[PDB]
């Protein structure tokens, strides 16, 4: 509603006030279509972003946290075209990190 009001102008307000219901429809127009329309056009399924990967470096830098203070890590996740699996934590092999 607010934004439909915003899209109006001085001239169009002055105009569509002479009908004296025109402007209430100009504003509530989406609400009119709602209250009379037994439908939700809107079920926006899931947000699906763009890839933000360090171009030269081939890394994704993703943040993560636990307890908000005591654990705050970041994954540098890199694409590996040679099938050589390897997971690293704090600069050391993951098995020897995570015991």
């Amino acid at each position: 509603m607010f934004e439909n009001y915003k899209l109006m102008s001085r001239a169009t307000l002055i105009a569509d006030s002479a009908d004296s219901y025109s402007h209430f429809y100009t504003v509530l127009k989406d609400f009119a279509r709602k209250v009379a329309g037994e439908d939700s056009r809107h079920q926006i399924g899931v947000r699906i972003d763009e890839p933000e990967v360090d171009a030269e470096t081939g890394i994704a830098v993703g943040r993560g946290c636990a307890d908000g203070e005591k654990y705050q890590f970041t994954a540098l996740l890199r694409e590996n075209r040679d099938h050589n699996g390897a997971i690293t934590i704090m600069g050391k092999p993951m098995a020897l990190v995570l015991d």
Binding site: F2, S20, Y21, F24, V27
Partner: protein, 292 residues
């Protein structure tokens, strides 16, 4: 008693008589009681419903340059969706009253159309003029709802009235279409509304909604219109809240009455450390979630 003495605070340059007399009392049988309120510049006018006493040119300038008050109220309500403002129940309620201004005339004319068995020929200009003049003076406050309805049902219609009726009506209660057409004509001839279709719409919908009630056309004469003791507006008869009929649902914390400020509560009167035990503010969030 270890009796307490309070020397009366006398007015000063700094501490005026009004404050020193209401913010302070020298008789300590009222100490630590509670916080009173009162209304000033615009709160007083908002509550007291004192209409501006008009004038000529100046009040008419302020009054002519009004424009569609109902809309401008709506503008002011929505604008709380902008970045620098919040949507406020006070704005919504100024909208709600600027839209429900013509509650009196509407509840009346609905009573007239639908609670008056056999109202003459309302479309006949005689009873139509009774109707026009009564509803005209029901708005404009000169008449009450109750007295005006009695003036309606008592106005002079036609001689040998029962005898003309028992010829046209079996059980006496005529068709209501002439009545409601007359009332919509009433409120569209008298500019009770700025936006015309509104008159008819309320006149129509209030009737439709009542059509569902048991004894949907009897009203206990006391509660029916204004009197001393009335019904809550959800329970009024041709009123706008009667469809807003619902109720609340509460799961209180183990500690729910203590935290009466902790939530994301709008504060009109902000806390200060003298009453505020450990409260931090309505914006702080001790348990934050990570998010872009």
């Amino acid at each position: 008693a270890k009796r307490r003495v309070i020397v009366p605070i006398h007015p000063t340059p700094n501490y005026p008589a009004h404050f020193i007399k209401a913010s302070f009392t020298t008789d300590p049988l009222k100490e630590k009681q509670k916080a009173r309120f009162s209304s000033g510049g615009e709160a007083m006018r908002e509550v007291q419903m004192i209409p501006k006493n008009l004038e000529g040119e100046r009040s008419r300038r302020e009054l002519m340059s009004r424009g569609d008050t109902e809309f401008e109220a709506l503008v002011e309500f929505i604008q709380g969706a902008s970045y620098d403002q919040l949507i406020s129940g006070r704005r919504f309620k100024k909208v709600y009253d600027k839209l429900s201004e013509n509650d009196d005339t509407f509840v009346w004319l609905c009573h007239t159309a639908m609670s008056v068995l056999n109202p003459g020929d309302v479309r006949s200009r005689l009873v139509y003029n009774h109707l026009r003049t009564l509803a005209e003076a029901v708005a404009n406050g000169e008449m009450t709802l109750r007295t005006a309805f009695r003036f309606y049902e008592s106005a002079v219609r036609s001689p040998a009235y029962r005898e003309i009726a028992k010829r046209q009506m079996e059980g006496g209660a005529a068709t209501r279409l002439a009545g409601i057409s007359a009332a919509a004509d009433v409120m569209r001839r008298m500019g009770l509304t700025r936006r015309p279709m509104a008159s008819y719409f309320e006149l129509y919908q209030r009737i439709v909604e009542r059509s569902e009630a048991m004894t949907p056309w009897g009203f206990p004469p006391l509660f029916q219109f204004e009197e001393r003791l009335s019904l809550e507006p959800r329970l009024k008869f041709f009123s706008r809240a009667s469809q807003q009929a619902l109720e609340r649902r509460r799961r209180g914390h183990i500690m729910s009455a203590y935290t009466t400020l902790q939530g994301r509560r709008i504060f009109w009167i902000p806390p200060t450390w003298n009453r505020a035990g450990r409260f931090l503010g309505p914006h702080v969030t001790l348990y934050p979630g990570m998010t872009p």
